[PDB]
């Protein structure tokens, strides 16, 4: 029944501010408290903030204390997260979450009922990604991974690009057998790298051409690198 849709995520520099929004639908928004939770790449869930149904109680994790502010607008069934003084360590996928308990305002002058949240996250959105980095937009350098029963592996290293993602094809999409493109790794340099690999008949080498087609929209680049036996 209930639906939550986060927006406002992107790539930003440390020290700047960014506001996230969550559009709630198909339940009585004004009657429920709400939560923000984040998951940094390849890690667990980490609670960031909560707000009670009447918006009178606000709670934050000590890691975001003083920097983040949670708010709501019942008129728009929207939950907000104002993130100021952003740090690289704030990089994560941010989820909006509804709290299970429904309340009816019991104290007025508008509602300022102080009954807090129960803390059971009964509905979650798909989340919005926030990336905080000192890096600037940069297309990849593409380096060949040369080969050398009756099979050989070859690929291309797509290195030092920012931000995600890159896409990879082989021979303009005519070669799709045995191809595997790996997830990206984040180097200490703050630039991403990944690799794509294909296994091909060792017999065809020296005659058959294999081209790695790399695309990085953020920097508006298309690279077509040849990978030969050498």
């Amino acid at each position: 029944q209930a639906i939550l849709v986060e927006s406002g995520g992107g790539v930003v520099q440390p020290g700047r501010s960014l506001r996230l929004s969550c559009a709630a639908s198909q339940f009585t928004f004004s009657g429920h408290g709400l939560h923000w939770v984040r998951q940094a790449p390849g890690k667990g869930l980490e609670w960031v903030a909560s707000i009670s149904f009447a918006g009178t109680k606000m709670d934050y994790a000590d890691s975001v204390k003083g920097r983040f502010a949670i708010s709501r607008d019942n008129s728009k069934n929207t939950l907000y997260l104002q993130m100021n003084s952003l740090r690289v360590e704030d990089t994560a996928l941010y989820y909006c979450a509804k709290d299970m308990r429904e309340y009816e305002c019991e104290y007025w002058t508008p509602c300022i009922d102080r009954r807090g949240v129960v803390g059971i996250f009964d509905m979650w959105g798909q989340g919005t990604m926030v990336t905080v980095s000192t890096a600037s937009t940069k297309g990849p350098s593409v380096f060949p991974l040369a080969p050398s029963g009756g099979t050989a592996a070859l690929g291309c290293l797509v290195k030092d690009y920012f931000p995600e993602p890159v896409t990879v094809s082989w021979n303009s999409g005519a070669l799709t057998s045995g191809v595997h493109t790996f997830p990206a790794v984040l180097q200490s340099s703050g630039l991403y790298s990944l690799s794509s690999v294909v296994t091909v008949p060792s017999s065809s080498l020296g005659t058959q051409t294999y081209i790695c087609n790399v695309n990085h929209k953020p920097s508006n680049t298309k690279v077509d690198k040849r990978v030969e036996p050498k």
């Binding site: 939560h35 939770v37 390849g42 667990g44 869930l45 980490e46 609670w47 903030a49 909560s50 709670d59 934050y60 994790a61 989820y95 979450a97 299970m100 807090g116 949240v117 129960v118 803390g119 059971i120 996250f121 009964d122 509905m123 979650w124 959105g125 798909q126 989340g127 350098s141 380096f143 060949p144 991974l145 040369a146 592996a153 690929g155 290293l157 290195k159 191809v179 595997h180 790996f182 997830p183 990206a184 790794v185 984040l186 180097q187 200490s188 790298s193 990944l194 690799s195 690999v197 050498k230």
Partner: protein
């Protein structure tokens, strides 16, 4: 801080249990929820108030609590149960928020084990010419999708400049992974040998490379 083991595995139809152990301040007099999370989707409430389920989550899932150590249990394991599971407690009692488990990855052994094939590429001449050096270790055709990688330079363990990806499913439903070792051209040239050692299900497969 709610601590869970990193992983658990079992064949289909079998039962697994995931424990969430914590202190007496967080757990002890607070209820415990459980959340399922499939990587490409929104997290999902499985259990709340220790043992209650928000249907239609099936009774194959059950929760319990032993003073200060909650336990999720999953019977009749099926493919669709493969996900990350987290416990969580709310201790705004007062002013302290929610805490989540660490948590735990559930694997369903749905095919026989396959040993990894290891391919180690040295740095390309083109890369050295760009004043960089990267060893690329590609691992393929293994199941289950879990491995650890260890790099060595002249038989000595190397941790610096190492990056590894979490195993991803190939088109043939086995897994692949990748690991990188970043060096300078001088480093690459100043050692006689480098090796990528992949451990999968207690056994190791190793490849070595050297300048020329």
């Amino acid at each position: 801080v709610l601590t869970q083991p990193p992983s658990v595995s079992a064949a289909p139809g079998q039962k697994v249990t995931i424990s969430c152990s914590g202190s007496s301040s967080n757990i002890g007099d607070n209820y415990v929820s459980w959340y399922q999370h499939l990587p490409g989707t929104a997290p999902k409430l499985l259990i709340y108030e220790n043992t209650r389920r928000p249907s239609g989550i099936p009774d194959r899932f059950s929760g319990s609590k032993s003073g200060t150590s909650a336990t999720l249990a999953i019977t009749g394991l099926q493919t669709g149960d493969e996900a990350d599971y987290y416990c969580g407690t709310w201790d705004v009692r007062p002013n302290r928020g929610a805490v989540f488990g660490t948590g735990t990855k559930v694997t369903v052994l749905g095919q026989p084990k396959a040993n990894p094939t290891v391919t180690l590429f040295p740095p390309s001449s083109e890369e050295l010419q760009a004043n960089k050096a990267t060893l690329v270790c590609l691992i393929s055709d293994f199941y289950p999708g879990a491995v650890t990688v260890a790099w060595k330079a002249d038989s000595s363990p190397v941790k610096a400049g190492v990056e590894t990806t979490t195993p991803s499913k190939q088109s043939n439903n086995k897994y692949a992974a990748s690991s990188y070792l970043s060096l300078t051209p001088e480093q690459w040239k100043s050692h006689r040998s480098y090796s990528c050692q992949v451990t999968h299900e207690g056994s190791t497969v190793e490849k070595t490379v050297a300048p020329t």
